[PDB]
Design an enzyme around this catalytic site. Structure first.
Site, PDB file in Angstrom:
ATOM      1  N   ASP A 155      34.783  41.193  54.722  1.00  0.00           N
ATOM      2  CA  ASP A 155      34.498  40.335  53.724  1.00  0.00           C
ATOM      3  C   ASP A 155      33.565  39.104  54.539  1.00  0.00           C
ATOM      4  O   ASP A 155      33.840  37.871  53.807  1.00  0.00           O
ATOM      5  CB  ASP A 155      35.777  39.804  53.079  1.00  0.00           C
ATOM      6  N   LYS A 157      30.851  36.438  54.645  1.00  0.00           N
ATOM      7  CA  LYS A 157      30.200  35.894  53.330  1.00  0.00           C
ATOM      8  C   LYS A 157      30.178  34.220  53.614  1.00  0.00           C
ATOM      9  O   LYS A 157      31.184  33.925  54.234  1.00  0.00           O
ATOM     10  CB  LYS A 157      30.400  36.504  52.119  1.00  0.00           C
ATOM     11  N   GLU A 159      30.985  32.131  51.723  1.00  0.00           N
ATOM     12  CA  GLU A 159      32.007  31.402  51.036  1.00  0.00           C
ATOM     13  C   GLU A 159      33.146  31.185  51.685  1.00  0.00           C
ATOM     14  O   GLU A 159      34.081  30.532  51.507  1.00  0.00           O
ATOM     15  CB  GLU A 159      32.036  32.096  49.687  1.00  0.00           C
ATOM     16  N   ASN A 160      33.444  32.281  52.625  1.00  0.00           N
ATOM     17  CA  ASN A 160      34.467  32.329  53.466  1.00  0.00           C
ATOM     18  C   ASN A 160      34.399  31.807  54.754  1.00  0.00           C
ATOM     19  O   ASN A 160      35.220  31.817  55.506  1.00  0.00           O
ATOM     20  CB  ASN A 160      35.203  33.972  53.564  1.00  0.00           C
ATOM     21  N   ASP A 173      39.710  33.411  55.128  1.00  0.00           N
ATOM     22  CA  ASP A 173      40.200  34.280  54.412  1.00  0.00           C
ATOM     23  C   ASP A 173      40.374  35.778  55.075  1.00  0.00           C
ATOM     24  O   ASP A 173      39.340  36.314  55.601  1.00  0.00           O
ATOM     25  CB  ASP A 173      39.440  34.539  52.825  1.00  0.00           C
ATOM     26  N   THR A 190      31.394  41.208  49.003  1.00  0.00           N
ATOM     27  CA  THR A 190      30.503  40.845  48.157  1.00  0.00           C
ATOM     28  C   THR A 190      29.164  41.761  48.265  1.00  0.00           C
ATOM     29  O   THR A 190      28.671  41.829  49.466  1.00  0.00           O
ATOM     30  CB  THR A 190      30.103  39.127  48.386  1.00  0.00           C
TER      31      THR A 190
END
EC number: 2.7.11.11
Length: 324
Positions: A155, A157, A159-160, A173, A190
Site C-alpha cells: 500500500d 503511496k 498518503e500513507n 497504515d 491505489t
C-alpha cells in the site's frame, strides 16, 4: 556484510515472539481522556486521547465490531492488528495499545502531528533528488525490514507517509499488509502504484513493493506519477503498456534506477534478484546515502515541518474477534 545479517536474525526473533503470542487488552478505555475527534475511519471515529497518567497523546481508532462484520472485514481487521502489535522499526508507526469492549475494538496508535507527504508534494510541487533520496532511503530500509519478515506492504503511496517532527518518514497504515512466503493474488492498493503483475492477476510477491518504490521515487522527483489518467481502468492500461517517459531534469542515475524498479520482468527487477536489496542500496543513485546514519536518524533532514501540539450493555460479536 554480516552486521546486517544478525540485525535481521534478531529482528525476526523479536517479530516471531510477538507474532506467535499476540498481546490482548493491553489497556482500557478508562485510562485515556478524550480530547477531540481527529477524523473518521471505515468502522468508526479516530479520537485524539490523552493517557491519564503519562500525559502522552494518542490517535485512538475506534472500530465498531458489527460494522466490521457487515463490511466483511473480520479477517483483515484481525490481521492488521496482529501485524502491528508485532513489528518495530524506526519508520513504522506504533500500535501503542489495543483493547476491546462490548461494542468496539480500539487501536491506540502513536500520534505524531504533521501532515502527509501527499499534501506536501502537492503544495511544494516537487522534491529535489537529494530530498527524494533521503525519503526513499527510509522506505528501502523499511521494506528490507518487512520483507525479511515475509511481510508484503502492498500500500505504498504518498498518503500513507507522514513527515514527522524531525522531518523523517513514518509509514502510517498497515491496512493491506500481508504475511506470505511465495505468492498471493489480491487486487488492492491505489492504481498509480500497482505492479503490472497485480493488475494482471497472475499472482505476485514482495517485488510489487519495489515496483511501488519506483513509482514513489518518480512522483517525488517529477511532481506527478509515471502512470496516470482520469479513470482507474485507464491507469491500469497505461501501467501494462509500460511506457515511462522521464522529465528532462531527471539525472542519469535516477532514470537508471527507475528502469530497474519499474521493470516488468521479474527476472530483472531490482529487489528480488539473488543480491536482494543490495542491488538497490549499492546503486549509483544512492552512492551518497549513509544507510547506517539513516537508520539511526542522524542525517540532517532536508525539511522540518511547522511545529504543532494537539457502548452497548451486550457483548457484540464475541467469537468473531476473540483473537483481538
Amino acid at each position: 556484510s554480516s552486521d546486517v545479517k544478525e540485525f535481521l536474525a534478531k529482528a525476526k526473533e523479536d517479530f516471531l515472539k510477538k507474532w506467535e503470542s499476540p498481546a490482548q487488552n493491553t489497556a482500557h478505555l478508562d485510562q485515556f481522556e478524550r480530547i477531540k475527534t481527529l477524523g473518521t475511519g471505515s468502522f468508526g471515529r479516530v479520537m485524539l486521547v490523552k493517557h491519564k497518567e503519562t500525559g502522552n497523546h494518542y490517535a485512538m481508532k475506534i472500530l465498531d465490531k458489527q460494522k466490521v462484520v457487515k463490511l466483511k472485514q473480520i479477517e483483515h481487521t484481525l490481521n492488521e492488528k496482529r501485524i502491528l502489535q508485532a513489528v518495530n522499526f524506526p519508520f513504522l508507526v506504533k500500535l501503542e495499545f489495543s483493547f476491546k469492549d462490548n461494542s468496539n475494538l480500539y487501536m491506540v496508535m502513536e500520534y505524531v502531528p504533521g501532515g502527509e507527504m501527499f499534501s506536501h508534494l502537492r503544495r511544494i510541487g516537487r522534491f529535489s533528488e537529494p530530498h527524494a533520496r533521503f525519503y526513499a532511503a527510509q522506505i528501502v530500509l523499511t521494506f528490507e525490514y518487512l520483507h525479511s519478515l515475509d511481510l508484503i506492504y502492498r500500500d505504498l503511496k504518498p498518503e500513507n507517509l507522514l513527515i514527522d517532527q524531525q522531518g523523517y518518514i513514518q509509514v502510517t497504515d498497515f491496512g493491506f499488509a500481508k504475511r506470505v512466503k511465495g505468492r498471493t493474488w489480491t487486487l488492492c492498493g491505489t492504481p498509480e502504484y500497482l505492479a503490472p503483475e497485480i493488475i494482471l492477476s497472475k499472482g505476485y510477491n514482495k517485488a510489487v513493493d519495489w515496483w511501488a518504490l519506483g513509482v514513489l521515487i518518480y512522483e517525488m522527483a517529477a511532481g506527478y506519477p509515471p502512470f496516470f489518467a482520469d479513470q482507474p481502468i485507464q491507469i491500469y492500461e497505461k501501467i501494462v503498456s509500460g511506457k515511462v517517459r522521464f522529465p528532462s531534469h531527471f539525472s542519469s542515475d535516477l532514470k537508471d534506477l527507475l528502469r530497474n524498479l519499474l521493470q516488468v520482468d521479474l527476472t530483472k527487477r531490482f529487489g528480488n534478484l539473488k543480491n536482494g536489496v543490495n542491488d538497490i542500496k549499492n546503486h549509483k543513485w544512492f552512492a551518497t546515502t549513509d544507510w547506517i546514519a539513516i537508520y539511526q536518524r542522524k542525517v540532517e533532514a532536508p525539511f522540518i515541518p511547522k511545529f504543532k501540539g494537539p457502548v452497548s450493555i451486550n457483548e457484540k460479536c464475541g467469537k468473531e474477534f476473540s483473537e483481538f
